[PDB]
């Protein structure tokens, strides 16, 4: 019974942020997974020529709080079921400021920064 994620993901698709408490709870769930070894900001990829679903991150180059939040919530709900790709991350001034505008403070940014240090 992980319907809690469903609610979060549903909420994020409407582009409504999550709360600090939830953002924190999400990162910990992820960290828990990490430390061991279906349709929607993101964009659909079909494959060609001769499994799992495919997703591309961002438009082309340049990320919003809700985007990266959704990224995490997705991978926690679906694991290998959804492969997510970008070109060639938490450490940008625009993203820090965005967290700071949408939350009382810098905690959410810390939670993510911490979390992505596991990738």
């Amino acid at each position: 019974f992980t319907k809690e994620l469903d609610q979060w993901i549903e909420q994020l698709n409407e582009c409504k942020q999550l709360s600090e408490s939830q953002v924190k709870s999400l990162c910990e769930k992820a960290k828990e997974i990490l430390t061991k070894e279906c349709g929607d900001g993101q964009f659909h990829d079909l494959m060609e020529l001769f499994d799992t679903n495919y997703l591309f991150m961002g438009d082309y180059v340049d990320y919003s709080v809700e985007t990266v939040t959704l990224l995490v919530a997705l991978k926690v709900r679906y694991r290998e079921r959804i492969t997510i790709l970008r070109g060639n991350i938490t450490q940008v001034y625009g993203f820090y400021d965005e967290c700071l505008r949408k939350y009382g403070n810098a905690n959410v940014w810390k939670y993510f920064t911490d979390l992505f240090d596991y990738l």
């Binding site: 001034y93 820090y96 009382g104």
Partner: protein
């Protein structure tokens, strides 16, 4: 007026410490918003209390820098945690105009904590540089650190009651405080890394 001063009895060390500890605990699980008056007032009070504890400790000189950890009494062990709590509380302040100030102040608290734990051989670790930035170029360390913290927190959760309710021998009591110190070594290390990243961002602006 000299009389009134002689006659006033202010909180002593154990109270100062215990209250500042309660306050930090409260802020860490506050179901109110972080930057609300309710939480921010507790942070201000806590820092004030710990600031007073820190001064008491300085005057008492409980901890030298050329001493063995066995020479420190069991109940004095907790006082080692003060700088780490100061760091923690400092981070819990919200006031963006002064964020860079808070990070540098916090970093210094955590370094103080780490520096002491390191002289006393509380655990084997690499002591971070005294000043931003502590160069680090790596993910494995974090996985290891995460598993370590989960294991410490579990052991602690099994012993807390026994100690607080006075049903633990001295051996048990010391092992418990050792475990807190280690737990807080990990936390401080992790926070300094976090702080250095936030400063880098704030500076470049």
């Amino acid at each position: 007026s000299m009389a009134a001063e002689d006659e006033l009895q202010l909180p002593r060390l154990p109270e100062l410490f215990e209250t500042g500890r309660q306050l930090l605990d409260e802020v860490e699980v506050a179901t109110e918003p972080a930057g609300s008056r309710i939480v921010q007032e507790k942070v201000f009070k806590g820092l004030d209390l710990l600031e007073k504890a820190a001064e008491m400790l300085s005057q008492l000189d409980l901890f030298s820098r050329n001493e063995d950890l066995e020479e420190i009494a069991s109940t004095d062990l907790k006082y080692l945690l003060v700088p780490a709590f100061q760091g923690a509380l400092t981070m819990k302040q919200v006031n963006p105009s002064k964020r860079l100030d808070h990070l540098q102040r916090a970093r210094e608290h955590f370094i103080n904590y780490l520096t002491q734990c390191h002289c006393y051989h509380v655990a084997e670790f690499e002591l971070p540089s005294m000043a931003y930035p502590s160069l680090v170029a790596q993910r494995q360390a974090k996985i290891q650190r995460y598993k370590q913290k989960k294991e410490l927190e579990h052991r602690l959760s099994a012993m807390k009651s026994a100690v607080e309710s006075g049903q633990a021998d001295d051996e048990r009591v010391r092992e418990y405080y050792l475990l807190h110190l280690q737990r807080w070594i990990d936390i401080s290390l992790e926070e300094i890394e976090s702080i250095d990243q936030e400063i880098k961002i704030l500076r470049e602006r």
